[PDB]
Amino acid sequence: CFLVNLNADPALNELLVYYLKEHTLIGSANSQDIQLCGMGILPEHCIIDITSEGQVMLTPQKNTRTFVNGSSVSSPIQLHHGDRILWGNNHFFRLNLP
Amino acid sequence: HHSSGRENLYFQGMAKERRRAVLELLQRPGNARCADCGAPDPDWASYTLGVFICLSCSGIHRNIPQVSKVKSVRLDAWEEAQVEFMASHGNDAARARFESKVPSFYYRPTPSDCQLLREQWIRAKYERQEFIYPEKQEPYSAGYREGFLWKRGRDNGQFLSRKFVLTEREGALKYFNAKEPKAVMKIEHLNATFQPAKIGHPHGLQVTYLKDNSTRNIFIYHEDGKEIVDWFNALRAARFHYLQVAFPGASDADLVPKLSRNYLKEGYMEKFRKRWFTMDDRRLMYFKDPLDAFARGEVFIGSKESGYTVLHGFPWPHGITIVTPDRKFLFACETESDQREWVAAFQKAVDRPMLPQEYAVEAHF
Ligand SMILES: [Zn+2]
């Protein structure tokens, strides 16, 4: 279970894959388990969780620009393999599940 | 009234005489539909703008509180001055004020269009006032626009920043990844359509160039919403102006509907292989991924007259078979809701008389 950065250039020294923990913290704060810096990304921006039942669930923090397959989300939402995620201005990621 | 003695309580009662007033206003000429998306039976209002709108649009108006403040016509208490404003305004008033100067090529959203289109329509009119003040339209009215747009790679599926240039002079959209441009797309062959869901991005625009009976799909987006929509409408300006000169004698009214085509239906079906399907007017394209650059295959859907029929069942649950003069194409849908639709979108083609160019397209397939 990993996220690809859809804006990373393979021909450049750009980090292309971020791996997810079972309870993954995403944001700008050093604490976050995936640290992203950019326009409109809070110290604590998101939370992705891998369930014991096997499913992937995204939980946006309040007052955050967050889209999943192009639509905004302000409550929790289940992710599927291949779904596309946008956070803030241009933190644009795809999801792959095993 | 009040009650006698020390406590002396004020009672209001069930009157609701003021939100009754506004309700009666919904029967005035021009207020039958959403001021912004045209959806019937609006039941919300912006009282600072004095327009009558649907639930969905009213949501978008709440984001613009410096311009619009909303109340339910039925579930909200209304101050007296607020009813007065509605009474002395309404949707016809707002058309004359805020839609005063709307270029005939500028795209007007329908209720089913994506959120970006509907929000940027409301903001254009009311916040920016793009159609009171012509100066504000320069981005899509100069006939030349250039800027960077995140574009999807052909096969790698990444989205990388690339300079684009729409130029009406040459009559083409072109991009550079540079000296000469990486590609040059003749405006005669451009279509543009918003596809946020497919593209995975709220600002996702699908641009198609049709060279040699093949239709390349380009998938692009802009970090800012206004800019992608300006791009969208610039493209429409480009097509329009191109078409006026390509076809004078044709009216603007006859040319606007051609500017850009939105698909009647897309979604998966079985062909058994699962493929993605796009019904663009007459060419049923199909794909491995929806973000494929080129159709895996196409299928021409002609007319009842040219020996084309669509049929239910097969000789997945619900089937639709497209009987052509050469061969038959069996398709399986998941749901009946879809089968219903997919078939309805095909029948539109079977019914209509073919044009000469459509014979030329058929002659290929
Ligand atoms: Zn509306």
- Domain containing residue A92: CATH number: 2.60.200.20
Which residue of A7, A83, A86 is in closest CB contact with B202? A86
CB contact under 8 A, A69 and B200: yes
Nearest CA in chain A to B194: A70
Structure tokens at B142: 């100069």
Structure tokens at B48: 């600072």
How close does chain A come to B162, measured CA to CA in Å?
12
CA distances from A48 to A31, A38, A79, B239 (A): 15, 19, 9, 44
Listed resolution, Å: 3.0
CB contact under 8 A, A70 and B204: yes
Alpha-helical (H) ranges within B26-163 are: 55-62, 80-87, 91-98, 115-122
Report the distance separating Cα A3 and Cα B220, nearest Å.
Answer: 21
Report the distance separating Cα B54 and Cα B36, nearest Å.
Answer: 9
Buried b (16+ CB within 10 A) or exposed e, A35-60: ebeeeebbeebbbbbbeeeeebebeb
Structure tokens at B318: 């619900």
Q: Collect all residues with Cβ–Cβ distance below 8 Å to B309 and sequence separation of at least 6.
A: B322, B323, B350
Going along chain B from its start, the domains and CATH numbers come out as 1-141 (1.10.220.150), 142-249 (2.30.29.30), 250-365 (2.30.29.30)
CA B91 to centroid of ligand 1, rounded, Å: 12
The rounded radius of gyration (Å) of the Cα atoms in chain A is 13
Q: Collect all residues with Cβ–Cβ distance below 8 Å to B250 and sequence separation of at least 6.
A: B243, B244
Q: How many CB pairs under 8 A join A and B?
A: 49
Helix (H) or strand (E) holding B244: helix B225-246
Alpha-helical (H) ranges within B262-355 are: 336-351
CB contact under 8 A, B158 and A9: yes
Q: Half-sphere exposure of residue A63, counting CA atoms within 13 Å on the CB side?
A: 4
Report the distance separating Cα B89 and Cα B83, nearest Å.
Answer: 10
What count of residues does chain B have? 365
The domain of A21 spans: 1-98
Report the distance separating Cα A65 and Cα A74, nearest Å.
Answer: 9
What is the number of domains present in chain A? 1
CA B162 to centroid of ligand 1, rounded, Å: 35
Strands of the sheet with B283-287, listed across from one edge: B283-287, B274-280, B265-270, B328-333, B318-323, B309-312
Contact B22, B73 (CB under 8 A): yes
